[PDB]
């Protein structure tokens, strides 16, 4: 298996950026992350370490190698993960527990539905519930046991409101500690992206659900890379480069690639693969990775475009019609 690819959605100011940064900080402290372009990997060992206080209540053993978190949240990035469903394997829908569902919360729901991306809800800012007294970094189930009873009562009223919106939207959901069948109900996991409370359940649910239910998508197949472009930018000493996510196979230096551009399909060859310095050049990257790709002729590449490596010029040519067809469905 390779790493699930996780995207973070939700309304402005509900804590997406904060949550991703808390996760990364928690992982860096456990050991910590792997450095990818536009993404961070939490290794399975680190997830097992962070989930250690839950070991007696739930099985915490991982058969995924890690989780890859896309570091840019929100709807434009999610649109750039679409492919003939999504490249994303799982999403976190961040809702500020005090505020509830806002307009971009419902947009994210529609996008998730349309692309059939499975998800959970992170009911964030629980530290802002009147009376909350933090236990930093603790599992939700440990810290809530130490809050005033009125605190639990407010939390359950806010969660019930979320559950009401979700049902109205066609999607059964519940507090994660009130679910028997995680295939049938969307889990609501209360967290604080400020204090870290609930991050352990957060990570254990993501890991649990992806490795249990998505093993067919997560199968690594040795083969030429398949990916998506997330950004197009100018890079001094390399011209226009693309930041991509590789979701299957292996991408190597000097591989031929086919990518979509504004004046038609681009056929080029990898000149350098760049990763963050611990930029450094690497000879190859395996799925799942975020990598920066320097190749000639990428000026007109369309963000969101598929990227397909090719063993030969003749197989490249055969890919160009698929790429154009993909690009058309994405406009």
């Amino acid at each position: 298996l390779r790493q699930p690819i996780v995207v973070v959605l939700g309304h402005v100011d509900h804590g997406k950026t904060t949550l991703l940064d808390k996760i990364r900080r928690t992982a860096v402290a456990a050991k910590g992350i792997t450095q990818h372009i536009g993404a961070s990997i939490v290794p399975a060992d680190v997830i097992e370490k962070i989930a250690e206080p839950l070991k007696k209540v739930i099985p915490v053993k991982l058969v995924i190698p890690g989780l890859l978190f896309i570091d840019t949240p929100g709807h434009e990035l999610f649109s750039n993960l679409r492919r003939r469903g999504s490249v994303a394997d799982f999403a976190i829908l961040v809702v500020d527990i005090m505020e509830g569902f806002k307009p971009q919360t419902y947009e994210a729901l529609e996008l998730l539905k349309e692309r059939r991306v499975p998800f959970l809800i992170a009911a964030n800012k629980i530290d802002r519930i009147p009376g909350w007294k933090p236990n930093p970094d603790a599992p939700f189930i440990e810290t809530i046991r130490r809050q005033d009873p009125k605190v639990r009562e407010i939390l359950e009223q806010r969660v019930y409101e979320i559950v009401g919106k979700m049902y109205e939207a066609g999607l059964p959901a519940e507090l994660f500690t009130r679910i028997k069948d995680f295939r049938r109900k969307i889990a609501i996991v209360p967290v604080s992206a400020r204090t870290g409370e609930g991050i352990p359940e957060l990570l254990a649910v993501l890991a649990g659900l992806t490795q249990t239910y998505l093993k067919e998508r997560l199968r690594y197949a040795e083969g030429p890379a398949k990916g998506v472009v997330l950004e197009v930018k100018e890079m001094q000493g390399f011209g226009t480069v693309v930041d991509a996510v590789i979701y299957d196979g292996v991408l190597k230096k000097e591989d031929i690639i086919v990518v979509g551009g504004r004046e038609g399909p681009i056929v080029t060859r990898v000149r350098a693969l760049l990763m963050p310095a611990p930029f450094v050049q690497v000879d190859r990257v395996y799925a799942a990775a975020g990598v920066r790709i320097a190749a000639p002729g990428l000026d007109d590449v369309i963000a969101g475009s598929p990227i397909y490596a090719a063993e030969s010029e003749e197989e490249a040519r055969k890919l160009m019609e698929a790429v154009q067809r993909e690009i058309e469905e994405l406009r």
Binding site: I58, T177, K180, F182, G208
Partner: peptide
């Protein structure tokens, strides 16, 4: 429950 996460049920 094949995930085993319903070990949390009741908390």
């Amino acid at each position: 429950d094949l995930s085993g996460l319903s070990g949390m049920f009741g908390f």
